[PDB]
Symmetry: D2
Subunit: 248 residues, 4 copies
């Protein structure tokens, strides 16, 4: 397929969007290596004949291990998808500094570090592509979600920085900015709200298509940006939000 | 990807438009392209599509194009608004007639054609529209006022269309190309290194590269993408 | 008087934001020349001690006449505020072409033309400033308001174009992008809570609040600000 | 003037834009408290009749102490300007993790923490305003300046987050995004002159005072319906790429 025999690294591929991305790449012929804190990642890799590495991306040593083991296992690195991320509820008034720093480490520092590590391996095969999974919440903010909004905002401009600095290595770097996608994490957030039915309706209506997106739909955008079909696209931020950011 | 689907492409005689027409035809689509330039005839023949000589500045001609194209293809599933013109000059030098002509072709025409095409798309349960804007619709350049204003208008019109056509199951997006090596560019030059260095990839883009982005946005693979503006500029807009 | 003795042109100053802008400049000692199609602009001018010109900005001849007569009355032109605008309800599917074209003429072509005309007067005094009143609806769209969305989107990029081309004449050009403001025009459309909830401040803005932003951008305090689009929306565009 | 009797906190006020900002607020009648790691900030405070606090903004304990002592000295806190910042040359390929983290701490975490601390003081006087000094490099990137581009990008969206969360406390939060400003640091780093200047439509570098004027406006009541906004003060740099 579009990625036959290509080595693809996907962070946080145990479930949700990451899992959809890992499966999409496998369906296109890629040799996939994914990591996650969740042991369920093992099953995902088994189903797609890929490799799984249980990794805590908050730790710089673990990030180094993941790229090394993935590179050795796959034999090459062509694509890196920075999908793993976390959040810490609260505005600047109540978020605790340690939790805030942890979100910045996992959501912003990790993608920066992993991109550098992956780039050095891509150099061996003449280049490659990196896709960062940001969010519409990296372009705009929401109440009580300071750490997430700050870190994703940083990820958006980091994507531009990486695009400029890695262009010489023939590595393109882009990001997708999803709107509300029906992943386990979102279904949980909705189900645990005081009025789940109402919440679901409200979230759906944030999009022009009046429905939540599907993980597979975000995966298709990532696949496109990581493919040679997007050869003149780099440093771009692509919203995959069913029209959310087109109107208030 | 588009086997048997009806696709309308404006300004398909050369450059990006021609590449777009060829790309859809390669994917099995029934393509109807229009242009003022007669060479569009050979493009249609080479890809097995239909050519219509149309002056998009004229509203009657726009109505005629969609009617004739719909009849010829049998259905309309995708519309690509690619045709455009420019009128050199700042607000201080541009003449009103030429300014209005640029707005008619670059902004009014896409609005009108989208409405006409949408009515046909309703017959097949929806579809997709892709507008070819420009980085010069998100930013400006010296002495190119009509182009900058019309393309800026096209960018927000894309958002408007996305909102109003969502109920009809029609997605609407736009691509914003940077410097692409088309006849128009390989004419304005007729500078070289300057334009190339405007991008991080340090080279001009190829028409085919913009076409691939257009095909993606027009495809079901972009099912949750609407109202979006995608730069295809080799990293130009990522830095100054 | 931050603008004491300076000549200021304000379009659409009979009511709403335009009226507030005219009053603000007058309060600061400026010689204000405001135009509008509505007759009540006369009373506004009388109350602030300025000059009123009943003009139909859709007419290019009247636009030329306005700047010429206003310049003569004031003795000099230092600032131009393009505030006049109209809308045509409807999506691309229902808007009439003639109405769409008229919205483009008044909302986009008129500001382009007036800026050029005013710039020639500002040259006499070594430069000046132009402030275009765009809208959040020039950066984003809403349902059934295609003409307004497209024209305001064009006005946003035209502001960038003008800033680039007029810098040589030492004329800064910026735009304000107001969110929901409590003007009679808005009060009519409404005839509430939802519109207020669109802003983080949870209230509609006052015309006077938009005027203050306009005066800032038109002042020397904003000497290194040009080609900028400043939202005056109570936080609306900061979140969904 | 616009800030007569108002308590204003300015970070990194020893030199450059921060110094221009402190001087501007004092010029408008404000009671200014500025901090900086550089001891010469004392001179700025003395010149404008304000208060100086030597502070290492990378340290959370010193940040808490700064707001506490500044609030005590001024008697009230109405405005906070997050101006202090640092950079760490290098792309993601060459930057050292520790320096990258330090840049995030000073450029992004510090403004977040300080905004929270200052907001609690503003609540005592019915609200206030916060202005973050971002950069055009928070909206776009440049070569080999990853830490700065990432932190400023985060600061831009943090500005939106703060605006949404502090609105109820009647606190507006906005940011300015300066282009090339002729600070002593920039004047020393400098064909090179012409190139940097030609990045702006005005074809010249901006003055620190010009950025200060925008900050004053956004922090004033004249900007009462402006919050969560990012205002470029770049002489037209971001209006064009050619
Ligand atoms: N679902 C949405 O609506 C939505 C919208 C916008 C952006 N996104 C982004 O999409 C991505 C995935 O979202 P999701 O909904 O699938 O969420 P998710 O909770 O499933 O998170 C992604 C994966 O990251 C893993 N992970 C988190 N911290 C880790 C760490 N320190 N080490 C290793 N693995 C770690 C998690 O275990 C999880 O499997 C994220 O970057 C998220 O910010 C999602
Ligand atoms: N080439 C670039 O670098 C570049 C950059 C940004 C945006 N774009 C956009 O891409 C599109 C195509 O660009 P291009 O470089 O191929 O230019 P082009 O000169 O080849 O123009 C496209 C086609 O439009 C046709 N056309 C123009 N006015 C027409 C009318 N009234 N009726 C019918 N046909 C008409 C022309 O004959 C031409 O074949 C345009 O919308 C342009 O604005 C191009
Ligand atoms: N009110 C809001 O919420 C809001 C929000 C965003 C942007 N805006 C913008 O602010 C500006 C003023 O808005 P407003 O609410 O006061 O509206 P308004 O209805 O009062 O319109 C402004 C003035 O323009 C005049 N005008 C219109 N067409 C004219 C023509 N051809 N010749 C001469 N005068 C003409 C009108 O008579 C009116 O007095 C407009 O540019 C509008 O798009 C307003
Ligand atoms: N100079 C420019 O061209 C330019 C352009 C865009 C944005 N900016 C922004 O404007 C602001 C000021 O820039 P500047 O040019 O005056 O730079 P600067 O080097 O003078 O730095 C500002 C001040 O911050 C202080 N500072 C740095 N780290 C500190 C710490 N840990 N604790 C306490 N004080 C600390 C420095 O001592 C200095 O006095 C910054 O936020 C910068 O990113 C500057």
């Amino acid at each position: 397929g579009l990625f036959a025999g290509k080595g693809v690294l996907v962070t946080g591929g145990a479930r949700g969007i990451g899992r959809a991305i890992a499966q999409a790449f496998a369906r296109e012929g890629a040799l996939v290596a994914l990591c996650d804190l969740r042991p369920e990642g093992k099953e995902v890799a088994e189903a797609i004949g890929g490799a799984f590495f249980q990794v805590d991306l908050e730790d710089e040593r673990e990030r180094v291990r993941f790229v090394e083991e993935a590179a050795y296992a796959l034999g090459r690195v062509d694509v890196l998808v920075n999908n793993a991320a976390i959040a810490a509820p609260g505005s600047a008034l109540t978020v605790r500094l340690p939790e805030w720093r942890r979100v910045l480490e996992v959501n912003l520092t990790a993608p920066m570090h992993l991109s550098a590590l992956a780039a050095r391996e891509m150099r061996k095969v003449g280049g490659g592509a990196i896709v960062n999974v940001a969010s519409v919440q990296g372009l705009f903010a929401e109440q009580e979600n300071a750490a997430y909004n700050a870190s994703k905002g940083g990820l958006v401009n980091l994507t531009r920085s990486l695009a400029l600095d890695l262009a010489p290595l023939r590595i393109r770097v882009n990001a997708v900015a999803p709107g509300a996608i029906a992943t386990e994490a979102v279904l949980e957030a909705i189900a645990l709200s005081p009025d789940p039915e109402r919440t679901r309706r409200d979230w759906e209506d944030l999009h022009a298509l009046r429905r939540l997106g599907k993980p597979e739909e975000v995966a298709e955008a990532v696949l496109f940006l990581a493919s040679e079909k997007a050869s003149f696209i780099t440093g771009a931020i692509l919203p995959v939000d069913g029209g959310m950011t087109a109107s208030f």
